């Protein structure tokens, strides 16, 4: 693999509780320092990356509920003030919007009737927040008007806990996945959904949320067990289960256009697998860099795999440190791909700089 990294630093957080999520703020402009947030237990912690591998602790948000367990975080910005924002959620099923400058919760949404596994912001509209829950549904929120735009679930929605979801690059559609082994497509560029988003903006103080009972595509033919991580790779999909492989696939037949796929489409095309080892426990996430040239995944014994996505056989770099032995739950690349951060179950953070 052409990609090479050096481990330049590591630290363990004071509380010693596991770290489950990590996200670099890809909204920061050139000249501003590279910042990442970590989530685990009832804590959200902010760090700044400096020269000579320095990882500088900024501040932490501590939830009054000692029993809250944050599983996810996502960055956005306030379109009116240009200031950054951070959304966090987990076991309590409550979505908190944190001001990262002061690390205080500015507002919260009683998100779901159960735990939230993932949060994602729309790539073009910073106010559109997607939450995925153990209640079998996905919810789309407008954080400018504090409205619930839509609920994706019901009649043909997921039949078990939703574990992951992802918007495609231009934010026209969402692919979700869960414990029912299915991967479901939900178009948000439909006339119904574009109008519902427009309406949530027109709202001013209850807003009537859309109930989307039927996806635009559904498959149970990729994985034979829970699907705990899904990401778009252009018009293709990357998804994983417990079989030590990330499967690259697409709805329909080989030649079929994603935008021409009918909701009743029965076929799937499997293009290949990215194979690895010792990553068969649940809740292990993979990530990509901004340009989607690199794919990263940590395993249960602290190895970090990095694949070069610019292929047709994909070359793989294995990053290891003799002191890194705990399960790597999530990884995050800085926007310029110069830094890769991995977070672990033993509360450790690992910094890998690209050579």
């Amino acid at each position: 693999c052409k990609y090479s990294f050096k481990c330049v630093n590591s630290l363990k957080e004071d509380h010693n509780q596991p770290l489950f999520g990590v996200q670099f703020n890809w909204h920061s402009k050139e000249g501003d320092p590279l910042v990442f947030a970590t989530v685990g237990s009832n804590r959200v912690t902010l760090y700044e990356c400096h020269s000579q591998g320095e990882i500088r602790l900024l501040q932490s948000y501590v939830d009054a509920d000692a029993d809250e367990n944050f599983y996810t975080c996502a960055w956005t910005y306030d379109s009116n003030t240009s200031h950054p924002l951070l959304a966090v959620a987990g076991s309590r099923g409550i979505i908190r919007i944190i001001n990262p400058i002061t690390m205080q919760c500015i507002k919260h949404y009683v998100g779901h009737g159960n735990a939230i596994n993932e949060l994602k912001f729309h790539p073009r509209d910073p106010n559109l927040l997607l939450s995925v829950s153990k209640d079998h549904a996905l919810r789309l929120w407008n954080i400018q008007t504090d409205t619930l735009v839509a609920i994706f679930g019901g009649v043909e929605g997921h039949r078990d806990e939703v574990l992951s979801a992802d918007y495609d690059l231009l934010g026209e559609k969402i692919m979700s996945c869960g414990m029912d082994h299915s991967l479901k497509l939900w178009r948000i560029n439909s006339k119904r959904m574009m109008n519902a988003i427009k309406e949530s903006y027109d709202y001013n103080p209850p807003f009537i949320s859309q109930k989307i009972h039927f996806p635009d595509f559904s498959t149970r033919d990729i994985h034979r067990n829970y699907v705990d991580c899904v990401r778009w790779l252009g018009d293709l999909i990357l998804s994983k289960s417990c079989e030590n492989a990330i499967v690259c696939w697409k709805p329909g037949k080989m030649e079929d256009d994603i935008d021409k796929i009918k909701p009743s489409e029965s076929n799937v095309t499997i293009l290949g697998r990215f194979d690895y080892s010792q990553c068969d426990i649940w809740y292990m996430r993979f990530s990509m860099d901004f340009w989607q040239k690199m794919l990263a995944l940590g395993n249960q014994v602290g190895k970090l795999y990095v694949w070069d996505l610019e292929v047709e056989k994909a070359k793989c770099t294995t990053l290891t440190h003799h002191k890194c032995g705990a399960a790597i739950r999530q990884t995050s690349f800085s926007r310029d791909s110069s830094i890769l951060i991995a977070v672990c179950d033993d509360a450790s953070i690992w910094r890998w700089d690209r050579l």
């Binding site: 909204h27 402009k29 910005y77």
Partner: peptide
């Protein structure tokens, strides 16, 4: 090719997102 046509879509769409990011001035944390 399948992967080559897919790479061009990634390049074009990430370029659109990068141009939108370049036009923005988000205040530091």
């Amino acid at each position: 090719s399948m992967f080559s046509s897919n790479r061009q879509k990634i390049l074009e769409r990430t370029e659109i997102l990068n141009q939108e990011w370049k036009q923005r001035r988000i205040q530091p944390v």
